């Protein structure tokens, strides 16, 4: 068990098209999509809804009561996708989530670590898909070096046994 890590190379202008292809070709149970700002989370959730997919969104510039209600509704499976900022200081691990998408690649290795699991736990099935632009090159290099990991280029076919619970 362990999270399979890939990256797709894109320009900012291509990210939505790339994300649309991931939604139509991945066997997502639940997904979490991370952005680097509150403004981008809002813009992206509006876009995903226009693509035709359901999503909730949470960020730092929301009222506490709204943020908590949205997270609890997502955990209960009222929707299949969540768009958010780095709100989980100890990390995140809701069981139905088999796919994590870094729509914006993080700056810090500890942020990256918190997105793809929770502190003091073993490895679990899943995918972590990173959308990488040329401006993310330094952060990609340093996060791979700091974690001692390899974020591989996204393959032509993703083996379902790597992220689909009890199937293929």
């Amino acid at each position: 068990k362990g999270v399979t890590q890939y990256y797709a190379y894109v320009t900012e202008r291509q990210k939505v098209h790339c994300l649309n292809t991931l939604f139509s070709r991945l066997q997502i149970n639940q997904s979490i999509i991370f952005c680097n700002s509150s403004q981008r989370v809002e813009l992206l959730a509006k876009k995903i809804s226009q693509l035709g997919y359901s999503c909730f969104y949470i960020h730092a510039k929301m009222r506490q009561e709204h943020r908590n209600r949205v997270f609890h509704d997502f955990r209960n499976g009222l929707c299949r996708n969540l768009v958010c900022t780095d709100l989980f200081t100890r990390g995140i691990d809701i069981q139905a989530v088999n796919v994590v998408i870094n729509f914006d690649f993080p700056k810090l290795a500890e942020t990256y670590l918190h997105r793809i699991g929770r502190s003091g736990r073993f490895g679990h099935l899943g995918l972590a898909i990173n959308l990488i632009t040329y401006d993310d090159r330094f952060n990609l290099k340093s996060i791979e070096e700091q974690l001692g990991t390899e974020i591989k280029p996204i393959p032509s076919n993703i083996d379902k046994s790597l992220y689909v619970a009890e199937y293929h």
Binding site: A8, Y9, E12, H17, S24, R40, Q50, L51
Partner: peptide, 21 residues
């Protein structure tokens, strides 16, 4: 860096992961 691009202009075909890599 046009983040926003409507479904009308989004190409009907799948994103070319391989060509862009």
């Amino acid at each position: 860096d046009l983040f926003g691009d409507d479904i009308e202009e989004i190409p009907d075909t799948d994103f070319d992961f391989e060509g862009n890599l």
